[PDB]
Amino acid sequence: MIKGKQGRFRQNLLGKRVDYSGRSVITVGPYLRLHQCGLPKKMALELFKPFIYGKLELRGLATTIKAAKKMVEREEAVVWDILDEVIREHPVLLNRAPTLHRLGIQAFEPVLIEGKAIQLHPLVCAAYNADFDGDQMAVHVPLTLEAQLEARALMMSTNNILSPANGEPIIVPSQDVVLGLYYMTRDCVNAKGEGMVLTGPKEAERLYRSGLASLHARVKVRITEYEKDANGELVAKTSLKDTTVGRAILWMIVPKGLPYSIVNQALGKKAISKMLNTCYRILGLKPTVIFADQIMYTGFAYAARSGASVGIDDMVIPEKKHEIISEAEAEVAEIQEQFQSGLVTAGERYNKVIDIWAAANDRVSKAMMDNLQTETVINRDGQEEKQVSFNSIYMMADSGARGSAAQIRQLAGMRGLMAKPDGSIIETPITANFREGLNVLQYFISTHGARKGLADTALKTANSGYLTRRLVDVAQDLVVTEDDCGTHEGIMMTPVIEGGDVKEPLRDRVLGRVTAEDVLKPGTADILVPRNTLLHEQWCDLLEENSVDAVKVRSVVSCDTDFGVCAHCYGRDLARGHIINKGEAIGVIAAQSIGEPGTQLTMRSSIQVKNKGSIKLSNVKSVVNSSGKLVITSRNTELKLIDEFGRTKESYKVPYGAVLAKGDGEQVAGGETVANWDPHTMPVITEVSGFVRFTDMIDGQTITRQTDELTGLSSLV
């Protein structure tokens, strides 16, 4: 009765059923504000029944609870306005079943609807990871006053815009609005109403509505930027820019304090996300949310206007594909012949076959991509030109709305090679695309692969749930409970290097974490920052322009707080732009952040420097060989390429006993091989010149005279 899921602990004592609840399917209803959600009349009426009784008795329409129950039972017309009155400012909670992270449940204001489906503001769908393929949601209501205030002040949708896992926003215009905007901020080389001049975005809108100009054509227009470089003072400044009418129309929406350049590109998804991030970082919260609402409205309107449909004609197959494939096949034939005569072995035949197939597939992919993306050739009022294409598929792909290059490659080009169950790769690839029909065997193989994928997904989510459950259990007791523990130990955060380039610059590893010891600029003895300041963006910029290498930062692993951690040792909230507050349960949110993404994971010679700069070497225990080069005898020897300024730029592990052309502190040229070594055998490298004597080596019991017979040189083992 206690063990297992059915045990009281995990069944009735930790998770319970609850009154005052509802369940329904969800729809979009895009006309809503970001802070409110639709709600059926019936569910609304069912939930708030006690409040309805109270209001009825206050109005005196029912001097009892039984007559009141009767009245609500037959829902006289009065009851509906009473409901509307009660709902006025009463939030509710929406939840989706697999709630991984903190955002999986959120508060909302209700708006009554004559349906039976919970409308939902579309932007939050990304947060809920909620498709409209029939996903259901559950509704709760906060009864007591304190619950209502908690909801309004903490769980209101408008308060959760940055993922706790990282400062990245979480309200990115997901898939459709993004398409609309990208289509808006484009430019045909020669469209209706080109070259003219406008006296402001309003004229652009009027012109487009009258239809006298295309939605995107190059025009010079005067505008006014608002730069608040002064101390919270929005200085206006006018100019006469040259953009496309669509961009000008879009500019009407953006709030005051932003540079017009931010609205001057093709506006891919990344651009929109960055734009929102900057807008929040500058003009606080409310302008950002209202701007997002306007963004969504405009995006939907103009996406619908575009009428961007998909047709079979859009899948343009490259003309040269057949030739390429035929050539590859003929190539395969000769290799098969070489193996028929036995001149080559089977494994090498197999490997070369795979290699040439990959090469041909890559060629086909490149050819189709090129033939597609720039297909559009249009006279410019001169003779002829070309531009990026308006093929609906390419617009959808490049815009980032849906699908990477892989899917379009499969659609148009051959869909590569398929791997059989044991991980082996079939020698013959699938040479057919989906615009054409696959034959039996090809489809069979693809089906095998797809089933593998599906089964992997199922088992992966199953295990990930258990992992995260374990994770939260171990770190649920930890709560920040102090302001400062008063220490000086920390850790040297440095940009990550993987032999190759900077995998992650330092600026993002230390962003928003108080320092332990003040950094000194490379004007050494130059106190660049205090030792206990928060590294918000401006100071990060200071560091970057000073090219700092590593920083002593206060971690959490060493905080001297008992049964908790002082605020400074932790750092910024990362859920809002300021230090953590006192009391937060950081452990739980950290566990959730770590566990949520688990589902997306998968379950199952010589040194060639490439830059001109100074060479430096660390852990060097080396000698000069006969050729004058340098031979190393330490293992963890490390080679750095530093730039002229003196900041490390590249790093590589030096294998033991490797020959090196340079010494230390020389100058290298881009593409200069600097080191070499044998990766196979282990020598007995010496240090100094002289005779070698076979001391304590007698043939018969210590050594054997296994002299080489192929060549005839002395050899004893």
């Binding site: 609850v18 619908a304 449909s309 489809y443």
Partner: protein, 1316 residues
């Protein structure tokens, strides 16, 4: 070539491969299994007879007497199918067996008959199989899927270095009987050999070897070779076999014939053996050191002392050789061993063997099998013998023996059903050989190793195991004396067998409910092939290997159809053309390929046989002669594809569509979509709700009629004839003259199942699809069932679609729908709910259903009748009263909240011996009248048919048409006629007429008996009343409809038509999808479907326009002919000229709503032919047309794709889900809200949500939610009061469930409590 009925609507067809074999009868695999289960087989090797002959006879222990089997029989079913459905009892048959007790004479010698008696003892009732195959247990028709269990026999398996971390594989072998104890042999990491029985403790194998009365030397002789040394004048001149010299190194000087063949330190080259065999030398002088560490084969003893010098299996040493030499031993036999050829695996195990003799080995075996129980010299031997060699407790079926002999390269495919010494010896030999490298491990996922098993075998096994109990009972009875007066009735008991079979059928992990909201649902469900169940692996402990598609599934198991989620690769569906092997494997047809000609003759190949030959695939371009235009032909040789010569092939596929299931066979343009999305489309296709009136799909795959007719819904004529009279309820056909049998002419008649609830609360009924005087042909459709149209499947509706975003209303997958879809009302769906009410018998007396109840206004009572039962046809609403029931001291049933509808059927049942109220008597009388009138009409119709026949036979040889009508039919049979067989026929027909009279006269009484009788019931229940509500769910935003390409969506809004986009021509579209869906999830099939359907609709519209203004057939014939033309060498080749010039008119009428088009899945219509067909219409070949906005009215730039798509409305209704609860009931042991919509339960605030609330700073809300809103009684009572009093505050208290936990813990010896 085209049937008259077929000419109503003939689907234009694409595809070029000439079909060579029509699809077989889909429901074959079921009726045959059950058919074989129950039959009188003289061979006694099928079903009941085999079991009876096996268990019987039975001999007493003495045995002074025995009881033997003779024969059996099945009585008539007591009730018909419909009656069993109505009451809700099983549709079974009595079983009656004639058993024969014999008695010998005790004092007389063994074998004599003192006396003998016999009788036909009843035993058990066996449920029967309906015509369709389904069973009826309690009017709850279910279905039994087939299992896919690994076959009995032997298997050499290997663990692939997954244990001991040593990288060393460990080959094991398993023997699995069909009924008995398993057996396993395993290789220790230390090269030992271990027997294991039924997963019990491990054991050295040589023990069980000794169990067969096998000694050391016998075993060694069996398992190794000899090397003979000769003590001679000069130090062991040993005989040698040159063949033993591969893979060694000369350690000394090997010299003979005065020739140093090789020296020490040299490896034994092949040429060394060449020179050796050339010199033909046999004996080599060998140094004594060669025998340093050898082992003796047998024991050697001193002849004089009789004392063993060296017992067998003993190492070799110099002094031992001296003892042999003084003992005069000349021949010294030792074991020929090796490290790569012959490891001494037996010797090690023998050294491990603690036992040496038979008795001790058996004793320790007994101890292992049964811990404790100090054995006896007889217990172990009895145990072992009855265990592994008594047929009654151990059995390899014929399949097992065949497979076993097969694996061991034997010749006989038949043998005994038990084991033998040689069997085990050969098994172990083969295992050792595999260890040495020869022979290879055998996989498990090979289709050649797993076997299907249908119902019959399982039922037979259950019958046998039930029989065993009564067998034991009778045996213990006969062991007792007092046999002079026994009978074969008292010792036999029916209850054990009845229980044994009933429990299995009614309640088993394989007899499951039937999904019935489609014909397709029923079909695909019946063909299911599960891998779970008894003897099958478990859902939640399956690795990837099982779920993965083995290469052998090709053509035998549909790979693309599977229920995703918790169980994939386990619920596999059968492929279309698959058959079942005689044994139970899966066979598939293949066209025999001769030298260079593709014959039409076919052979059904099993999985194993396929691995040998070479098979070219279906779409290989031959030209009228099986001469492949190509030379490097693609063929699956053996678990892989390749390109082979034009002559080496041996077989060709039958049809492109032999790889898929029937379920996936219906998706057009399948060859373009992704795999998983096609799977999703299929699974959703399985869940379509029948609409109000079906509509053919404009673009079928041609598999529609097969599925429709093969399913049981539609009434298909059996013998062509003529409609003599039609009605909404029944049909009658005058049979064709020829199809008619010589005697008993009669005429065909059908009755139609009207509205009846399906398994999913969806009404089902049939409608005639013919008029009077319509000739019909054998096997043609007559009555359309649910979601069918003119005898072809039709699930959803085809509608005008356009691909574009629209104000975000189709943001993710939401589907925007215009208002015409609902106004024209082409998606409403009917549903039927059944509600029951009982009259228990409790203390304070029973309760009743009186029409009078307390504290209720007459308003509610207005709808009930005097009895207390609502009138039929009343239109009740949510929260009404259906039957008034009283509190014996108001339990009146009420309509569930929210549900509206109309009452259509009431029924009542009473315990026998109880008076019946007014309404019950009324209904009884009404049924009486109904049955009487029904049978009267039937009888007179049949008599009319008979007299029509009698008139027909008198039209020749004395026809007087006047005399026929002068005196009426009453006196016709007696008329004179020339003397011939005609008089015999007249007598025959008159006899049949009188027989019909008598049959009706008795059947009427039978039905009267069935009606008037009382009703059995469960104890306590006095009577039960059932009522049927009918509802029409129309549509709402929230519902879930979908297309066929796994492109599901939730309807979101109902715009008025005026806002919808409309073309320049004025037709507005009806659905707006989201283009963004396609690219990510690659399913172009929908786009191609849209184009093709648009073309078809254009053609239909052109025809309709031509018809609107009157146009003579001259134009119609031309245009239709040309339309049916324009195929790329299609095989349709339909000719219009041959038509009656009025069937032309009717066909045009049937086509004015489009021209149906067919598309085989992998023989689809490419782009060019679609383009040409479109251009036949005046539509833009590009497919995309310009549009105009409803609101603004302005044109959309960027021409848009529009067309027509076939879409289904799935069975997930928004009304079924939307649910709420403010404050309701409470669980009993724990005081929390109940769960589930059935009860008025509430939602479950799960653990993860608690975590999430913790992540926010929200604390109060969590506390309240899990303290006062759920658990703390006083807290919620006072909270209710506070809320009523407009004061939002709460008092936490303590959860009750915590006190529950506290008491529970304290129930254990743990003292737990709260401090201060």
């Amino acid at each position: 070539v085209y049937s008259y009925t077929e000419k109503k609507r003939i689907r234009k067809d694409f595809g070029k491969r000439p079909q060579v074999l029509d699809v077989p009868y889909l429901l074959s695999i079921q009726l045959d299994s059950f058919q074989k289960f129950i039959e009188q087989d003289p061979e006694g090797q099928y079903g009941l007879e085999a079991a009876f002959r096996s268990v019987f006879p039975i001999q007493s222990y003495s045995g002074n007497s025995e009881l033997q089997y003779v024969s059996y029989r099945l009585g008539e079913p007591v009730f018909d199918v419909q009656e069993c459905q109505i009451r809700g009892v099983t549709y079974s048959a009595p079983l009656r067996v004639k058993l024969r007790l014999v008695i010998y004479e005790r004092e007389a010698p063994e074998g004599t008959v003192k006396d003998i008696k016999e009788q036909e003892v009843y035993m058990g009732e066996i449920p029967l199989m309906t015509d369709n195959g389904t069973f009826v247990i309690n009017g709850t028709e279910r279905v039994i899927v087939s299992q896919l269990h690994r076959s009995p026999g032997v298997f050499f398996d290997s663990d692939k270095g997954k244990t001991h971390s040593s990288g060393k594989v460990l080959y094991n072998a398993r023997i699995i009987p069909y009924r008995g104890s398993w057996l396993d042999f395993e290789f220790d990491p230390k090269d030992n050999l271990f027997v294991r029985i039924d997963r019990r403790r491990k054991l050295p194998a040589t023990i069980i070897l000794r169990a067969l009365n096998y000694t050391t030397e016998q075993i060694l002789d069996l398992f190794f070779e000899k090397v003979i040394f000769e003590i001679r004048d000069n130090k062991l001149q040993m005989e040698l076999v040159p063949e033993r010299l591969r893979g060694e190194t000369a350690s000394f000087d090997i010299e003979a014939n005065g020739k140093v063949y090789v020296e020490k330190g040299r490896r034994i080259t092949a040429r060394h053996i060449r020179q050796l065999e050339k010199d033909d030398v046999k004996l080599i002088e060998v140094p004594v050191e060669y025998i340093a560490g050898k082992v003796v084969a047998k024991d050697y003893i001193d002849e004089s002392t009789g004392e063993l010098i060296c017992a067998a299996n003993m190492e070799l040493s110099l002094d031992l050789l001296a003892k042999l030499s003084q003992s005069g031993h000349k021949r010294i036999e030792t074991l020929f061993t090796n490290d790569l050829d012959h490891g001494p695996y037996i010797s090690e195990t023998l050294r491990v063997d603690p036992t040496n003799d038979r008795l001790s080995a058996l004793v320790e075996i007994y101890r292992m099998m049964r811990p404790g129980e100090p054995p006896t010299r007889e217990a172990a031997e009895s145990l072992f013998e009855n265990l592994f060699f008594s047929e009654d407790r151990y059995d390899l079926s014929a399949v097992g023996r065949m497979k076993f002999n097969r694996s061991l390269l034997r010749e006989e495919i038949e043998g005994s059903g038990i084991l033998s010494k040689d069997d085990i010896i050969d098994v172990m030999k083969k295992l050792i050989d595999i260890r040495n490298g020869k022979g290879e491990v055998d996989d498990i996922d090979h289709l050649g190793n797993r076997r299907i098993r249908s119902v019959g075998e399982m039922a037979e096994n259950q019958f046998r195991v039930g029989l065993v109990r009564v067998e034991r009972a009778v045996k213990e009875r006969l062991s007792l004396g007092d046999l002079d007066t026994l009978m074969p009735q008292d010792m036999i008991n029916a209850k054990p067998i009845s229980a044994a079979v009933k429990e299995f059928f009614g309640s088993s992990q394989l007899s499951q409910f039937m999904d019935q909201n489609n014909p397709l649902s029923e079909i695909t469900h019946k063909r299911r092939i599960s891998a779970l169940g008894p003897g099958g692996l478990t859902r939640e402990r399956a690795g990837f290997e099982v779920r993965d598609v083995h290469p052998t599934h090709y053509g035998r198991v549909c790979p693309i159809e599977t229920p995703e989620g918790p169980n994939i690769g386990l619920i596999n569906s059968l492929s279309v053309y698959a058959q079942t092997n005689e044994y139970g494997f899966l066979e598939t047809p293949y066209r025999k390929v001769t030298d260079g000609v593709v014959t039409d003759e076919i052979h059904y190949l099993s999985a194993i046989e396929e691995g040998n030959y070479v098979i070219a695939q279906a779409n290989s371009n031959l030209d009228e002669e099986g001469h492949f235009v190509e030379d490097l032909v693609t063929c699956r040789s053996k678990g892989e594809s390749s390109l082979f010569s034009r002559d080496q092939v041996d077989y060709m596929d039958v049809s492109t569509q032999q790889v898929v299931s029937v379920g996936a066979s219906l998706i057009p343009f399948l060859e373009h979509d992704d795999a998983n999305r096609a799977l999703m489309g299929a699974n959703m296709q399985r869940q379509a709700v029948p609409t109000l009136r079906a509509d053919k799909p404009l673009v079928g795959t041609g598999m529609e009629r097969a599925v429709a007719v093969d399913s049981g819904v539609t009434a298909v004529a059996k013998r062509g004839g003529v409609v003599q009279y039609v009605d909404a309820s029944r049909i009658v056909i005058k049979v064709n003259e020829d199809e008619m049998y010589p005697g008993e002419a009669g005429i065909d008649i059908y009755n139609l199942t009207k509205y009846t609830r399906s398994n999913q609360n969806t009404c089902i009924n049939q409608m005639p699809c013919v008029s009077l005087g319509e000739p019909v042909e054998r096997g043609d459709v007559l009555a359309d069932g649910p979601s069918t149209d003119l005898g072809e499947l039709a699930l959803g509706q085809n509608m005008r679609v356009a691909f574009m975003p629209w104000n975000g209303y189709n943001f993710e997958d939401s589907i925007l729908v215009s208002e015409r879809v609902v106004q024209e009302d082409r998606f409403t769906t009917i549903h039927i709910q059944e509600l029951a009410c009982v009259s228990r018998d409790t203390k304070l007396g029973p309760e009743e259903i009186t029409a009078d109840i307390p504290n209720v206004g007459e308003a509610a009572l207005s709808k009930l009748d005097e009895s207390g039962i609502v009138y039929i046809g009343a239109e009740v609403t949510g929260g009404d009263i259906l039957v008034g029931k009283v509190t014996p001291k108001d339990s009146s049933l009420r309509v569930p909240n929210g549900v509206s509808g109309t009452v259509i059927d009431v029924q009542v049942f009473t315990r026998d011996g109880v008076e019946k109220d007014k309404r019950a008597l009324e209904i009884e009388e009404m049924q009486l009248k109904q049955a009487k009138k029904d049978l009267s009409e039937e009888l007179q119709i049949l008599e009319a048919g008979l007299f029509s026949r009698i008139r027909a036979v008198l039209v020749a040889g004395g026809v007087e048409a006047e005399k026929l009508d002068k005196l009426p039919r009453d006196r016709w049979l007696e008329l004179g006629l020339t003397d011939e067989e005609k008089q015999n026929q007249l007598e025959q027909l008159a006899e049949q007429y009188d027989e019909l009279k008598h049959e009706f006269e008795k059947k009427l009484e039978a039905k009267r008996r069935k009606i008037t009788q009382g009703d059995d019931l469960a104890p306590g229940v006095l009577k039960i009343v059932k009522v049927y509500l009918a509802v029409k769910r129309r549509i709402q935003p929230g519902d879930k409809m979908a297309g066929r390409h796994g492109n599901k969506g939730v309807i979101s809004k109902i715009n008025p038509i005026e806002d919808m986009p409309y073309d320049e021509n004025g037709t507005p579209v009806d659905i707006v999808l989201n283009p963004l869906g396609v690219p990510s999830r690659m399913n172009i099939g929908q786009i191609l479907e849209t184009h093709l359907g648009m073309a078809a609709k254009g053609i239909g519209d052109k025809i309709n326009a031509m018809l609107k203004q009157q146009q003579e057939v001259a134009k119609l014939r031309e245009f239709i002919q040309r339309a049916y033309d324009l195929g790329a060498d299609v095989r349709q080749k339909v000719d219009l000229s041959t038509f009656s010039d009025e069937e032309v008119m009717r066909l045009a009428e049937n086509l004015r709503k489009g021209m149906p088009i067919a598309t085989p899945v992998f023989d689809g219509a490419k782009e060019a032919e679609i383009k040409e067909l479109l251009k036949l219409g005046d539509l833009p070949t590009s497919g995309q047309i310009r549009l105009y906005d409803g609101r603004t009215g302005e044109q959309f730039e960027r021409p848009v794709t529009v067309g027509y798509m076939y879409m289904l409305k799935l069975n997930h209704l928004v009304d079924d889900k939307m649910h709420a609860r403010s404050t309701g009931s409470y669980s009993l042991v724990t005081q929390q809200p109940l769960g589930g919509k059935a009860q008025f339960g509430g939602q479950r605030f799960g653990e993860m949500e608690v975590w999430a609330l913790e992540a926010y700073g929200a604390a109060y809300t969590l506390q309240e939610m899990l303290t006062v809103k759920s658990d703390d009684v006083n807290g919620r009572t006072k909270m209710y009061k506070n809320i009523v009093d407009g004061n939002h505050q709460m008092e936490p208290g303590m959860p009750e469930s915590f006190n529950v936990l506290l008491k529970e813990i304290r129930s254990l010896g743990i003292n737990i409590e709260l401090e201060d």
